[PDB]
Amino acid sequence: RARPCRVSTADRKVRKGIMAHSLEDLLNKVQDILKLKDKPFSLVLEEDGTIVETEEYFQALAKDTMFMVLLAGAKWKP
């Protein structure tokens, strides 16, 4: 069962809607969906940089939740 995800970039440049079956799968998709040079390593909340690293929390979040991928390196910025 898929899940709607609003994924933004670190520079708040582009926001895109992605259907994700789970966290892993989303992290698989977002690289080629958002034109990313290397695969992101962490999914974070755009609101405050809260780390989403479990499938349960990822599923429990609201459907209008704006995400923010962190690529394979360093952390969130406001």
Summarize the structure.
It comes from Mus musculus (Mouse). The chain has 78 residues and is an alpha+beta fold.
Percentage of helical residues?
Answer: 10-25%
Distance between the termini: 32 Å
CATH topology: Ubiquitin-like (UB roll)
Query: Rg, please?
Result: 11 Å
Number of strands: 5
How many domain units? 1
Number of helices: 2
The string of secondary-structure elements, in order, is EEHEEHE
Oligomer: monomer
Helix/strand-derived class?
A: alpha+beta
How would a textbook summarize the main sheet?
5 strands, mixed
Q: What proportion strand?
A: 25-35%
CATH architecture: Roll
- What is the C-level CATH assignment? Alpha Beta
Strand order, sheet with most strands: 2-1-5-3-4
Shape: globular
Organism: Mus musculus
Subcellular location: Lipid droplet; Endoplasmic reticulum; Nucleus
Protein name: Lipid transferase CIDEC
Domain CIDE-N: 1-78
What does this structure look like?
The protein has 2 helices and 5 strands. The termini are far apart. A hairpin with a 6-residue loop joins strand 1 (4-8) and strand 2 (15-19). Strands 2-1-5-3-4 form a 5-stranded mixed sheet. The chain has helices spanning 23-33, 55-60, and strands at residues 4-8, 15-19, 42-45, 51-52, 66-70. It is 22% helix and 27% strand. Belongs to the CIDE family. Keywords: Activator, Apoptosis, Endoplasmic reticulum, Lipid droplet, Lipid transport, Nucleus, Transcription, Transcription regulation, Transport, Ubl conjugation. GO terms for molecular function: lipid transfer activity; molecular condensate scaffold activity; phosphatidic acid binding; phosphatidylinositol binding; phosphatidylserine binding.
